[PDB]
């Protein structure tokens, strides 16, 4: 599923990301935009043999288990397939654990490069929330 900007902002708000651990809602919408272009089925195979899954491109080496990545740690204790649903529940649950580490949203390279330091709230403006 490919979410609309406002559609995802509303969904993420319902999934408690309006002010989760110091991060405003715009951060999450902006991150999804540059990580997966709002596509829940997005996947990207990495050099180390790991794969990034879903709307928030969660990595198979540290967060989810896809059974095909070497030093997998499965920090989110969840199968990577669960992160490929049109339902963002699993991705949001895992993203919350990820951001609860001291590195915060820096875990998301696209967010770090295209969102951090920008007017992220612009990503939720012009939306019915």
């Amino acid at each position: 599923k490919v979410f609309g900007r406002c559609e995802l902002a509303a969904a993420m708000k319902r999934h408690g990301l309006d002010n989760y651990r110091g991060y405003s809602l715009g951060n999450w919408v902006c991150a999804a935009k540059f990580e997966s272009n709002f596509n829940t089925q997005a996947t990207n195979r990495n050099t180390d043999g790991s794969t990034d899954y879903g709307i928030l491109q969660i990595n198979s080496r540290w967060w989810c288990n896809d059974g095909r990545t070497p030093g997998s740690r499965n920090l989110c204790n969840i199968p990577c397939s669960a992160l490929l649903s049109s339902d963002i529940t699993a991705s949001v649950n895992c993203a919350k654990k990820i951001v609860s580490d001291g590195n915060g949203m820096n875990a998301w390279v696209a967010w770090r490069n295209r969102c951090k330091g920008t007017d992220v709230q612009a990503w939720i403006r012009g939306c019915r929330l």
Partner: antibody
Amino acid sequence: DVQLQESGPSLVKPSQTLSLTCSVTGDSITSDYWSWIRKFPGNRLEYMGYVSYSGSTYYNPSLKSRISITRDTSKNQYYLDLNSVTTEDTATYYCANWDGDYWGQGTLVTVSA
Amino acid sequence: DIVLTQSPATLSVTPGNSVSLSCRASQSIGDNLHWYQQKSHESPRLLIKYASQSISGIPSRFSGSGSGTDFTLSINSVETEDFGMYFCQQSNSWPYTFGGGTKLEIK
């Protein structure tokens, strides 16, 4: 499957450092975030803090920086140190993973002269 | 810190009857509210995560609802094994905090 268990002294003196150990069996401590929670005599629960995969820690400000949570990969254990304890630190201490799915049995530690 | 207030403090019920326990937050926490059960001489057990998400291995009679500042834990047809303490906990902001708890007893 995963199992957690606390160990350490059950009786300590005021002003000393209270130290507890949580032994994890079934999986590596490098595969989760680990926490410490305590229950006071009146059914009052307090989340003490946790250590995440990067080594970063989060401690409850209520503890006034008297707390330290560390890990030992080789022993697959993590620890809790609480400095300068007082009778207000008497409580049942529990270790559990960040998700809250796995908890230790809990251990009562009494602080008294 | 975010303060969680639970009510009633105590609730006596007859097995077979249903009950609802309340937890209100001092500020909006979205869906970041979890429910725990705790019996004497035992560690807490997670019943519901993120306000309404089910947990594998928990009886289906437990359900959670709410968002923002108002949350409820419902038990459809209380069983004897359900008597004990119930606590809500928020994970929206650090430090995580617990409500004062509600004691469920047999009437």
